[PDB]
């Protein structure tokens, strides 16, 4: 059956990157017209998989992970990269077999007053494990005084709002990102294409 990429790519509201939405899709056929209708992509990168041969891929589940990030941070949605998004929000495993698709969403997600609805985690005690989700709001103790649950000096609320305004530079504009991760049944070399 055709993948519900309609719900993945034309979702009305994307997730905050810390609350990145995961959809599990049972073995499905990629309608590439759904993907390609979004162009130009800032990123359409695939690791291990050939982007045009996604239907030849022997897979049982695809996970689509959807979130909004800044355009200059889209670099960090790749294996081995480091920075606030990789380290504290969404870590790709180094052995990722999948695609990262990122398109500019300045038209939808910014507002002239600034859209402060998209949160990202700025502080965490240790790096995020691959595909770990946090969504905690415990005050981050950055110093030798425990915070007692009150924000203050060395006592930060872990989440910070992105500022998205139409007028911001291309690097500071909101990009929607979808990560497709495939549970491969055998290997990219084995062919299981629809008959």
């Amino acid at each position: 059956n055709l993948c519900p990429f309609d719900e993945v790519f034309n979702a009305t509201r994307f997730a905050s990157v810390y609350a990145w939405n995961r959809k599990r899709i049972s073995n499905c056929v990629a309608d590439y017209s759904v993907l390609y209708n979004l162009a130009p992509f800032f990123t359409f990168k695939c690791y291990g998989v050939s982007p045009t041969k996604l239907n030849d891929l022997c897979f049982t589940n695809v996970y689509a992970d959807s979130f909004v990030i800044r355009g200059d941070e889209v670099r960090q949605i790749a294996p081995g990269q480091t920075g606030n998004i990789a380290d504290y929000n969404y870590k790709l495993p180094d052995d990722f077999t999948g695609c990262v698709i990122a398109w500019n969403s300045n038209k939808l997600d910014s507002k002239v007053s600034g859209n402060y609805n998209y949160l990202y985690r700025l502080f965490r005690k240790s790096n995020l494990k691959p595909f770990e989700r946090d969504i905690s709001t415990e005050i981050y103790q950055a110093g030798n005084k425990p915070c007692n649950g009150v924000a203050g000096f060395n006592c930060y609320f872990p989440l910070r709002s992105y500022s998205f305004r139409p007028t911001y530079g291309v690097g500071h504009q909101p990009y929607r990102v979808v990560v497709l991760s495939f549970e491969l049944l055998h290997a990219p070399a084995t062919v299981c294409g629809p008959k």
């Binding site: 056929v29 309608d31 590439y32 017209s33 390609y36 162009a39 130009p40 992509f41 990123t43 359409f44 990168k45 695939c46 690791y47 291990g48 998989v49 050939s50 982007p51 045009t52 041969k53 239907n55 790749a78």
Partner: protein, 89 residues
């Protein structure tokens, strides 16, 4: 069947193509480093745009560029017979 390639810069490649494909809905330009576990990445251009610019190629590595025609009726990609290796320097 034609393909033309001009290097705008050592890191940037301008590609033009003609292939005998009836009603292409999208052209897909796929590029990546040769052989390695490197990323493969695509540019998508509408079927009317028979030219594309690839930019930000890593210096000093061998990139392979392949053009596909996508047909929505078939949901298939048809490879262009001619494929390009480029060395960015």
């Amino acid at each position: 069947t034609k393909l033309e390639v001009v290097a705008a810069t050592p890191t940037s490649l301008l590609i033009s193509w003609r292939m005998p494909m009836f009603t292409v809905d999208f052209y897909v330009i796929q590029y990546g480093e040769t052989g390695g576990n490197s990323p493969v990445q695509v540019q998508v251009v509408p079927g009317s745009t028979r030219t594309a610019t690839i930019s930000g190629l890593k210096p000093g590595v061998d990139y392979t560029i392949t053009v596909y025609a996508y047909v929505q009726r078939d949901n298939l990609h048809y490879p262009h017979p001619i494929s390009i290796n480029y060395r960015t320097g």
